[PDB]
């Protein structure tokens, strides 16, 4: 058996012609990039969500050739938070909960809030104000 194909008839494994050593072919690391912006009127600050990857494994490219976005400055930055949607770089996670402003996913939202330089923060969205009805 010289090689193997996946469902889409794409080669996913191959036998080396010289060494006859079996090799799996996995496509190079790829993913979606989402830019959370408060609005260019409000600010030029942004946050970057790398979707469906742990940011142990976010682009750590040190040369422009190694990875397609040539903007490395928003990778492995000071503000790094892991979500189930992806890992978000450039927004500080706060334990406070607010009404959703910019949806990120898995219950995490982002907002541009003052805290006193105003910056992008990430938080768990607030479902509402808790109440207890005085049942008797």
């Amino acid at each position: 058996q010289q090689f193997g194909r996946d469902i889409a008839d794409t080669t996913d494994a191959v036998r080396d012609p010289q060494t006859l050593e079996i090799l799996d072919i996995t496509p190079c690391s790829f993913g979606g990039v989402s830019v959370i912006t408060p609005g260019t009127n409000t600010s030029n600050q942004v946050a970057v969500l790398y979707q469906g990857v742990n940011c142990t494994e976010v682009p750590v490219a040190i040369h422009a050739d190694q990875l397609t976005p040539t903007w490395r400055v928003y990778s492995t930055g000071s503000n790094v938070f892991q979500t189930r949607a992806g890992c978000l770089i450039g927004a500080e996670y706060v334990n406070n909960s607010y009404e959703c402003d910019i949806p990120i996913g898995a219950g995490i939202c982002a907002s541009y809030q003052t805290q006193a330089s105003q910056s992008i923060i990430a938080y768990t969205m607030s479902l509402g104000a808790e109440n207890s009805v005085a049942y008797s």
């Binding site: 496509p27 979606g32 949607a85 969205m125 479902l127 109440n131």
Partner: protein, 417 residues
């Protein structure tokens, strides 16, 4: 002409309505699907305009639509109501529908059953072809918190929290309100409170067994998941089509042919793959419209069945609607409709009016019934025979006009005193 069937008993019936509210949010990397690792194919695809951008825009609209659907169905209430620590509620047992603190998810037993029922790997193979799944904005725990808040509001405040501030009411009095809503007097409930509570508890217990026993009970949800997965698989399989080219592999076409011949073959492959993507996106839009209609129905049922008592027939279950309970399910909602069903009907002789003196008397709120020798006035949905008096009847005209009028005495309460 003169026979009426009056129910002498009732059944508290709990039924389940299962409604999809959201579908899987999918994203397609258009370049990675049309041109996996061929940069030449990517440069050629740049010449096809805004096809990929339009597909991305449509899929993003679908995903935002799914989040909006879930928000409309479950985020109706802005207060996260909590059930009281003492769960008595007049003998009505809500443990199967109330959140269970022992479970880490804070999910009810029925909801836990619902979540259990709905279900290289296919995910990895699809991802390697540019097809990925975006997580929903609201977690399953957040949707469970919405359902728990809705249940707590319904149990502690009736329908008041739906129309404004939550107003505490004892649950037996709320269910008496609901019997008034279905046309049955409060005394029927207060006199039969233990029986009604036991019937409700037994029906709620049978709900879990009915959901467990039938594999296809939640099929309406599962089908939605299936309808997504198959579609994605179809897309992946459409990457094996040559579309009239020498090969389905872009790299083989480029390696084997000079630029003029390769262009004719890569054009065929790119056109076929773009057609496959357009077909997928169009069918996703149609399915998203169907899911939006389903979620709009679910939101309407949340408003009119859970946040109130509906007089619409069969909108909130089979029978006379009393109240409803929401339960979160994977990509959907299950409404437990508690309804009142008349039972143990009995035949009686009936007359449109009673002729007393020269006056015709009509029942103010009920029916004139006869067991064979004596005439009573009873409420329509329950047999509670009462003596015909001037209090429970009103007078209109002479006896001649009414067809079917029967002679009988109308007792005057004040005359003895």
């Amino acid at each position: 002409n003169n026979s009426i069937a009056i129910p002498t008993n009732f059944t508290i019936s709990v039924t389940t309505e299962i409604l999809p509210v959201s579908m899987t949010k999918t994203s397609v990397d258009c370049t990675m699907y049309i041109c996996g690792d061929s940069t030449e194919c990517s440069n050629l695809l740049l010449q096809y305009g805004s096809f990929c951008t339009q597909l991305k825009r449509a899929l993003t609209g679908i995903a935002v639509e799914q989040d909006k659907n879930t928000q409309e169905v479950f985020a109706q209430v802005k207060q996260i109501y909590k059930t009281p620590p003492i769960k008595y509620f007049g003998g009505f047992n809500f443990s199967q529908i109330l959140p269970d603190p022992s479970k880490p998810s804070k999910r009810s037993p029925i909801e836990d059953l619902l979540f259990n029922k709905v279900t290289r790997d296919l995910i990895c193979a699809q991802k390697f072809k540019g097809l990925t799944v975006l997580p929903p904005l609201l977690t399953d725990e957040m949707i469970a918190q919405y359902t728990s808040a809705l249940l707590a509001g319904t149990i502690t405040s009736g329908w008041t929290f739906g129309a404004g501030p939550a107003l505490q009411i004892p649950f037996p009095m709320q269910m008496a309100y609901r019997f008034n809503g279905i046309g049955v007097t409060q005394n029927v409930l207060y006199e039969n409170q233990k029986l009604i509570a036991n019937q409700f508890n037994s029906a709620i217990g049978k709900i879990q067994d009915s959901l467990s026993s039938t594999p296809s009970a939640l099929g309406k949800l599962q089908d939605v998941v299936n309808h997504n997965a198959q579609a994605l698989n179809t897309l992946v399989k459409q990457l094996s089509s040559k579309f009239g080219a020498i090969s389905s592999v872009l790299n083989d076409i480029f390696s084997r042919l000079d630029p003029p011949e390769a262009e004719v073959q890569i054009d065929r492959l790119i056109t076929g793959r773009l057609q496959s993507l357009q077909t997928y996106v169009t069918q996703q839009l149609i399915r998203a419209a169907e899911i939006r209609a389903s979620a709009n129905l679910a939101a309407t049922k949340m408003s009119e069945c859970v946040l109130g008592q509906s007089k619409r027939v069969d909108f909130c279950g089979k029978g006379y609607h009393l109240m409803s309970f929401p339960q979160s399910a994977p990509h959907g909602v299950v409404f437990l409709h508690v309804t009142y069903v008349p039972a143990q009907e009995k035949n009686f002789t009936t007359a449109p009016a009673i002729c007393h003196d020269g006056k015709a008397h009509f029942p103010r709120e009920g029916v004139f019934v006869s067991n064979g020798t004596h005439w009573f006035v009873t409420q329509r949905n329950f047999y509670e025979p009462q003596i015909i008096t001037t209090d429970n009847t009103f007078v209109s005209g002479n006896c001649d006009v009414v067809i079917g009028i029967v002679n009988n005495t109308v007792y005057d309460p004040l005359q003895p005193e």
